[PDB]
Amino acid sequence: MNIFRLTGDLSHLAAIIILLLKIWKSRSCAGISGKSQLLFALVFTTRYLDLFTSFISLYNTSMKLIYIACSYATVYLIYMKFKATYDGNHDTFRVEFLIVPVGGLSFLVNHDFSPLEILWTFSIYLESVAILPQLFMISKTGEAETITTHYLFFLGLYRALYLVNWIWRYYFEGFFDLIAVVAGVVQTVLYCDFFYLYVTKVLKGKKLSLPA
């Protein structure tokens, strides 16, 4: 553990709770891409199969279970409990264009040709593009509520802090994983437009339009 990974992980949990309580309290999933939430749920399901093979720490086990629980819980609120407010007409991103290529790439570009390693690699490739349906839906519809931009900020900030974590771990422990780093850089660069607009508009009381 270093303070970058921990703050990244706290940023990630914050993101997930904010989105969960926004939907819970307002009893609506207005402006939320169900499809992005399916992808995050699929990312945690393929990444955390090592719950069955490895005990790292109680923290590590706990967060994996919290992340899995909240991801499935968010998909439940969107597609069952509050489906009445699910804007299916504007959440039109074709997710097959992420899943099939990422699946294909996870099979051909990996550290090891075993089922657990391939599914991990899949989790890492998929997380890098998981937010595109959410960002596309905002580009399409008018704007995002303030609370949604805060979710996107903290989610975006989480993997940005992992990059710093990876700099720290390379310098200090000689640890490097180029599949996680490259995917991490893709994941983070996809938040650049949103980050700019969040700083210059949302933190200045303006709202955050992404034309296209």
Numbering used by the authors: 1 to 212
Kindly provide excerpts from the paper associated with this entry:
Our previous work has shown the KDEL receptor has a transporter-like architecture and undergoes pH-dependent closure around cognate retrieval signals.
We then determined structures for chicken KDELR2 bound to HDEL and RDEL signals. These structures with TAEHDEL and TAERDEL peptides have resolutions of 2.24 and 2.31 Å, respectively. Both HDEL and RDEL peptides are bound in a vertical orientation with respect to the membrane, with the side chains clearly resolved in the electron density map. Superimposing the three peptides reveals little movement of the peptide at the −1 and −2 positions when bound to the receptor. For RDEL, we observe slight movement of the backbone Cα atom of the peptide to accommodate the larger arginine side chain, resulting in a minor repositioning of the glutamate at the −3 position in the receptor. Nonetheless, the position of the positive charge at the −4 position on all three peptides is identical relative to E117 and W120 within the receptor, supporting the view that a salt bridge is formed with E117 on TM5. For RDEL, the arginine side chain sits in the same position as the amine group of KDEL and could thus interact with W120 via a cation-π interaction and E117 via a classical salt bridge interaction.
